[PDB]
Symmetry: C4
Subunit: 333 residues, 4 copies
């Protein structure tokens, strides 16, 4: 029998590693952190100066965040937990601040096609078909319909996935980028409520195995707690990282300051939390420390990435994606 | 020598995984959580609408719980820590509330045959031969005697086991279902007192390898803490889950509200605890948070299961039983 | 290269398991806990009714403990942190309480031969050559000298060891039992101070591989925290268990009651602690909860063992020594 | 696919062990701790009586520490976070206290060559080219330039490295010793900020595989918390250990006593901390317990090492470097 039980070796299909399971190995380097090139592909066509996108969540990204993110060289994805007219107006607001990149989330519900067309009319650059489970005909069909209808002017992202097969399906549907993350989010309770998930380093490695041969960038979404996690996600093969928790504490996120026991916080909640759905939960409502301006958070995050590129001899993100890991033990934390 | 010591490779026979060691992998799916079919076999003949049974414990299941459980589409197993006449009367009470399914525990002591016949007379549907260690001639003989005597009107469950061989023995004795769990219970101290046990995912996989080829359902009993654990136990191959801790906090369980430090609790104790035996302990007496009505707890539990069936593309429990896992590391919690 | 570094596969020689790493697997059984036979060989010649010996420590075993232990069916080993005359007088005191078995520790210092002869004269049954590191010519020579001089009337134990080779050396020197434990003691700081040790399940398996073929019993010494650990140590192949921590809280141990924050304690200290040596430390001075009479502690310990013998179908300790383990993961605790 | 994801087996290159992952196995021994020879090579030419060097940090080693360390039989490395004139004057101060060994850190910046020549003029014995990442042409060139210019009178150390290849590069550049440690320091945040590092036992094993064949000693730098860690680092093949945390609490380190909540502390900060750089941080500012005189700390540290040499039968450090480990599990701590 199989050492962990039963007679089927495929029952337990893999050993899933998360960020805390690995470290980047230093390598020969003539790259100074200050000189590394941090640009990377968000989608097949769109390159960002900084490989970071803010999550499509209503305690993270509305117009103010999208504007600050694009000015910092990344991009925001506007959340979709509001009327179609307001979302499109947020898109327009970002555009009124210059030639700034902006994305917007849509679902696959009755109302999604209308939403997508309104955002298109508003001048959106990227449409993110954004769902709990993208390995599904309705999601694949929406990705394909958008790519064939508005595809030559708008880039279309599909997510989220957690396996090589799911990512391959989005590639075949025409996705211009694939977003990876089922289970790892800081406010996510999918793992405890449904018992479902995939540790994020293994999920990225698997998705990249399906996406890289086709020139489709992977967006690592969820579970990033530290600047060093960004470096790890990219070295695992992702081209960008999507941040929720790390940006929800910033001045530019929606929400006000909360003072508890003399310290400053902001509210941060899952899109699957009770309160987000009353606008069986798979997300919580919580708080995160107030962090100040976005520009300052992004500076330290990018600083950590630059440090990693120095250590690994990576002049570009493309080079970082070829870096090697060491696996650590439980004693290692 | 063997890497862990000595010269015998069979000394340390396997690596045992528990619920926290695994996650369900998302898979291609056209199944909406709301549309999944949650029915499953309790025994060879009996199918439940909801794959959940309440434990035969005196702080969990008396008539009120059995009634609420059957109305929710599951079943209760009446505990046996009272006189034969009272247990049979509880059986009758459940039946007075309609054509509701109900089970009842018996042991293998002098008094067990009399108990079993009285419950039969009371109209019980399922008899559960329920013991700390079922891999034993007296237990096997009782299972067989019941199956040959009352077997065509009553289904007979045997438990508990933790190995492929033990489950195979119950199958050969005529069990209509096999119950798995030695060591994993929340109030169980078998692991620390006797040093005995089997991690529950590996125990289910092993028991299913013996039971499924013979069409005998496995009941996963003990160690379930979250709705996601129910999904994991079924995907490991079990057909139903038995709950103690998760239901002991409910309005319908025996026992009154306990107020400690401004919060509400109910008493929850092992059948092998001092107080359960004074009616060398292998169970504790504890408290669990008061949770309100059973209907509400079952709704969230079934909600979590439906979510898992959506993620895994499982239209039925039978399909869920073929789902795949990823193993996670210690960093994964 | 070797996956953990360097080019030498023998550098990291084995994966060491401790008690918490394993569980005993239930097996077919017709043995009732109440009926199991708990007797076992302390030495080649001496069998105990209960497979438990108290440590040769000055906060655990003086005459009162030795007397209580023998009456409970085990034995005490009198510590040697006092003058030769007092130790011998303690031996005599035990003998004045009937035909009770008693052992006594000696070292390998200048004074040890004199000590050994005085204890012999006092009527001691077992001499324990007791040292931090027995894999050493002076220890081997002392074991052999005693066996050739007083060996036909007194049994001679040697310890402590942690490897197959060390145990083999004591067997060749003539030891009648071998004591295993370098590093695992509750009050031991050898692991942090010297960086030396061996996880106790692997140490027992290795020592038994050297001792069992020669009919020499292994005494598992140190690291036992729960009654279930006793069962594990014996199933790993040991014939008896030596207890320090578990008995230091008892009425019969040396030392008085200590009241701290409304709860009762006794002092418990390593023989290598500062205070034991002032009569570079490798042991601490601590407290353990007061537990009451020895008889009560031994009853629960033996109760747990009986439970294990029931679960594993072990009618005798000899049978228990053939039981199988499952290895558990970090999530398993 | 590879069990942890993707199709490349080299992506995750190794399993990295840290000190807490291993223990030294006791071995046959005729070596008394008091009699072991603790001397070891700092560099190809320089042997120390005690295999310990103090870190080049401004809360650890200035003239007072360098003096105390050499008198204890080790050496100090003077930090370089001050003007060239003051560092050279510290070197001279040490020399005014007798024929004491002393080292000094230099970087690879514009000012480093001048620094190195001034320290040379001051009578320094060892120059340590000391950087976050030594696997780099500028570092290799500096090591080589120093070795060819002042190499016959001064020994030249290069660091830090974490891989076999990096250490091989320093050997080829002419290093007289190689210093190992990227990530493990107590005040280091490289792992969380950059996601970069190498567990220290595996890093030492790998570096030694490159250095030992060429007769170049390895200095184990960072992550040492206990005296037992020193023994482990040497048995892994290092010839000396560099200490920061363990010595920063001593009377001889720079800094004053800090009283917080009735207990005594000293400040201890990374050279990459904000405050060290304001003279994106990769080190913190913290406190360590005040420990008293250096002589006392070194005595217990050397005591622990002697204990390890006794247990492993190592008469010399060279013998200790051939000792074997056992790997432990997470339960092992
Ligand atoms: C609503 C609630 O919680 C959420 C909400 C949003 C996300 C989310 C992640 N991302 C990237 C974008 N949005 C995740 C969880 C929930 O339980 N959703 C849910 N659980 C299972 C399914 C399902 C699985 C198969 C199929 Br087919 C259809 C639905 N959906
Ligand atoms: C009474 C006490 O604690 C309990 C009580 C009930 C259960 C329990 C689980 N389940 C599913 C239904 N009931 C478990 C433990 C206890 O120690 N029992 C016990 N330990 C060993 C044996 C034994 C092992 C081999 C043989 Br053969 C006979 C008895 N029995
Ligand atoms: C005195 C201090 O602490 C102790 C004291 C007693 C025990 C102890 C266990 N047991 C079963 C019986 N007694 C263990 C540690 C200490 O450090 N002892 C020590 N550490 C290394 C050596 C050594 C190693 C090789 C050789 Br060869 C000679 C001595 N001795
Ligand atoms: C200044 C700050 O923090 C420090 C400061 C000193 C040390 C330190 C260790 N040791 C032994 C001696 N000094 C370590 C970290 C920092 O982030 N430094 C840094 N991170 C990446 C690079 C880099 C990587 C490739 C190349 Br090429 C050039 C620079 N440098
Ligand atoms: O309610 C939820 N349940 C599960 N995942 C969520 C939920 N809400 C947002 N997310 C995901 O979690 C990511 C943020 O993760 P974080 O950066 O670790 O906080 C988002 O970008 C989404 O992919
Ligand atoms: O005293 C005990 N010792 C060991 N297992 C028990 C005891 N009492 C009840 N159980 C088992 O534990 C299960 C409940 O586990 P739980 O749902 O994790 O709380 C029951 O259904 C029984 O199988
Ligand atoms: O000071 C010490 N250092 C290391 N081991 C000790 C020391 N003192 C007693 N012991 C060992 O530890 C055992 C007790 O371990 P315990 O039962 O876990 O508390 C004794 O029987 C000795 O083998
Ligand atoms: O700011 C820093 N970041 C990373 N490593 C540092 C820093 N400052 C000092 N070190 C390293 O950490 C070592 C001390 O580690 P410790 O002995 O564990 O405290 C030093 O000898 C340096 O190699």
């Amino acid at each position: 029998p199989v050492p962990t039980g039963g007679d089927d070796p495929t029952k337990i299909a893999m050993l899933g590693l998360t960020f805390d399971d690995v470290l980047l190995l230093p390598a020969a380097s003539d790259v100074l952190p200050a000189n590394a090139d941090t640009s990377s592909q968000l989608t097949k066509k769109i390159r960002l100066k900084v490989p970071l996108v803010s999550s499509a969540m209503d305690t993270v990204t509305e117009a103010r965040m999208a504007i600050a993110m694009a000015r910092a060289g990344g991009m925001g994805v506007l959340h979709r937990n509001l009327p179609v007219a307001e979302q499109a107006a947020q898109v327009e607001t970002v555009k009124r601040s210059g030639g700034l990149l902006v994305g917007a989330a849509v679902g696959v519900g009755d109302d999604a096609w209308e939403r997508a067309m309104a955002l298109r009319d508003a001048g959106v650059d990227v449409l993110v078909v954004d769902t709990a489970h993208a390995h599904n005909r309705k999601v694949l069909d929406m990705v394909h319909r958008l790519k064939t209808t508005v595809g030559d002017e708008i880039e279309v992202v599909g997510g989220n996935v957690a396996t090589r097969a799911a990512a391959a399906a989005l590639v075949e549907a025409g996705a211009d980028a694939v977003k990876v993350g089922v289970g790892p989010g800081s406010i996510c309770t999918t793992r405890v409520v449904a018992g479902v998930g995939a540790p994020q380093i293994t999920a990225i490695l698997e998705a990249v195995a399906a996406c890289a041969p086709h020139g489709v960038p992977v967006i690592a979404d969820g579970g990033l707690q530290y600047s060093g996690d960004i470096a790890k996600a990219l070295a695992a093969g992702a081209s960008t990282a999507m941040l929720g928790s790390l940006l929800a504490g910033t001045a530019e996120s929606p929400g006000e300051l909360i003072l508890v026991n003399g310290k400053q916080f902001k509210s941060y909640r899952g899109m699957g939390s009770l309160g987000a759905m009353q606008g069986v939960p798979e997300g919580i409502e919580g708080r995160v420390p107030f962090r100040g301006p976005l520009s300052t958070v992004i500076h330290q995050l990018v600083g950590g990435l630059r440090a990693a590129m120095g250590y690994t001899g990576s002049a570009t993100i493309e080079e970082l994606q070829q870096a090697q890991f060491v696996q650590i033990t439980a004693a290692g934390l």
